[PDB]
């Protein structure tokens, strides 16, 4: 009967997939809800740079600090051997960068040094955890910086979420219940104006569908397990309405192109349902 047939359709798709896949959908203006494998903790990876950006922009809003205020970034903070367009652009460090530019690198391009710079700015991972909890969203654990996750293999699992929590947080954000209008407009634009994950949530959608999103990805260990392949965001339906969706393909033995196709197929079948 509608939602449960779509849910059964997704579960049948997931049966032969060697991964633990979590799915959540929340209508923005017309309450719609769908969960698959909700009672599970999924490693977030890069998706938690969205949570960090909320915390940075909230701090700017509350303390009346301009997004153009510049922060001095020491060379020792532009770590090597990590994804970081910031360090590529400023290899020698010791540069004054506006918060706006660090945020853009972090959200739109998933900069890891940008991420840790901003964690320092808001007072560390626990401060972001508290900020998120006090918004009334439970079941998000934020324990490790990018530099910390790049050490032991296990550390990435201490940044975890249920799919429900993400989609609740995306909806609060998207309905502008969190930020000032200017902070909201900026974060939203950087989530639309990203080049990442073209084969994930957006993979099978019609050309030009606007999708504000944040990806997350992990390494693959030598037992062929890719810990995390994620995409979360807000999608615009043909009638101009929206839905928040989060897909976490975790602890997967499948090849990377299958992991992305899973996100794209699931999103497509949710799209088809709400369009019909
Ligand atoms: O497009 C719409 O009319 C509504 C809808 C209808 C089907 O549940 O559900 C999704 C949530 C939303 O905004 N959409
Ligand atoms: N997706 C449709 C569902 C329906 O018309 O029954 C609405 O909107
Ligand atoms: Cl690969």
Three-state SS string over the chain comes to CCHHHHHHHHHHHHCCCCCEEEEEEEECCCCCEEEECCCCCEECHHHHHHHHHHHHHHHHHHHCCCCCCEEEECHHHCCCCCCCHHHHHCCCCCEEEEHHHHHHHHHHHCCHHHHHHHHHHCCCHHHHHHHHHHCCCCCEECCCCHHHHCCCHHHHHHCEECHHHHHHHHHHHHCCCCCCHHHHHHHHHHHHCCCCCCCCCCCCCCCCCCEEEEEEECCECCCCCEEEEEEEEEEECCCCCEEEEEEEEEEECCCHHHHHHHHHHHHHHHHHHHHC
How many Å apart are CA 221 and CA 51, to the nearest integer?
Answer: 27
Longest dimension (CA), the chain: 60
Q: Is the CB of 272 under 6 A from ligand 1?
A: no
CATH of 1-276, one of 3.20.20.70, 2.40.50.100, 3.30.70.1060, 3.40.710.10: 3.40.710.10
Instruction: Say yes or no: CB of residue 32 within 6 Å of ligand 1.
Output: yes
Q: Cα angle at 118 between 22 and 166, to 5 degrees?
A: 20
CA of 65 to the centre of ligand 3 (A): 41
Is 11's C-beta closer than 6 angstroms to any atom of ligand 1?
no
Instruction: In whole angstroms, give the CA distance from residue 243 to residue 10.
Output: 17
275 C-alpha to ligand 3 centroid (Å): 33
**Resolved by:** X-ray
The CA-atom distances, in angstroms, between 226 and each of 156, 221, 259 are 12, 7, 9
* Resolution (Å) of this entry: 2.2
**Atom 5 of ligand 2, residue of closest alpha carbon:** 276
Q: What residue ranges do the domains of the chain occupy?
A: 1-276
């Amino acid at each position: 009967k509608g939602t449960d047939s779509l849910k059964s359709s997704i579960e049948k798709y997931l049966k032969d997939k060697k991964a633990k896949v979590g799915v959540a959908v929340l209508g923005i203006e017309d309450n719609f809800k769908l969960n698959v494998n909700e009672k599970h903790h999924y490693p977030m990876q890069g998706t938690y740079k969205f949570h960090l950006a909320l915390a940075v922009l909230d701090k700017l809003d509350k303390e009346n600090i301009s997004i153009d205020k510049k922060l001095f970034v020491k060379k020792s903070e532009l770590l090597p051997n990590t994804w970081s367009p910031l360090r590529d652009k400023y290899p020698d460090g010791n540069v004054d960068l506006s918060i706006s530019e660090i945020l853009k690198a972090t959200v739109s391009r998933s900069d890891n040094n940008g991420c840790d710079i901003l964690f320092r700015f808001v007072g560390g991972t626990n401060k972001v955890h508290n900020f998120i909890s006090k918004l009334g969203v439970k079941n998000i654990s934020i324990k490790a910086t990018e530099e910390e996750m790049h050490k032991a293999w296990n550390v990435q699992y201490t940044n975890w979420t249920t799919p429900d929590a993400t989609v609740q947080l995306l909806k609060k954000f998207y309905k502008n219940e969190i930020l000032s209008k200017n902070s909201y407009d900026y974060l939203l634009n950087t989530m639309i104006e990203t080049t990442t994950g073209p084969k994930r949530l957006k993979g099978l959608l019609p050309d030009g569908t606007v999708v504000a999103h944040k990806t997350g990805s992990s390494d693959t260990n030598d037992k062929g397990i890719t810990a995390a392949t994620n995409d979360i965001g807000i999608i615009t339906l043909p009638n101009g309405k929206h839905f928040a969706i989060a897909v976490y393909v975790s602890d997967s033995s499948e090849k990377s192109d299958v992991n992305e196709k899973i996100i794209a197929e699931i999103c497509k079948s949710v799209w088809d349902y709400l369009v019909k």
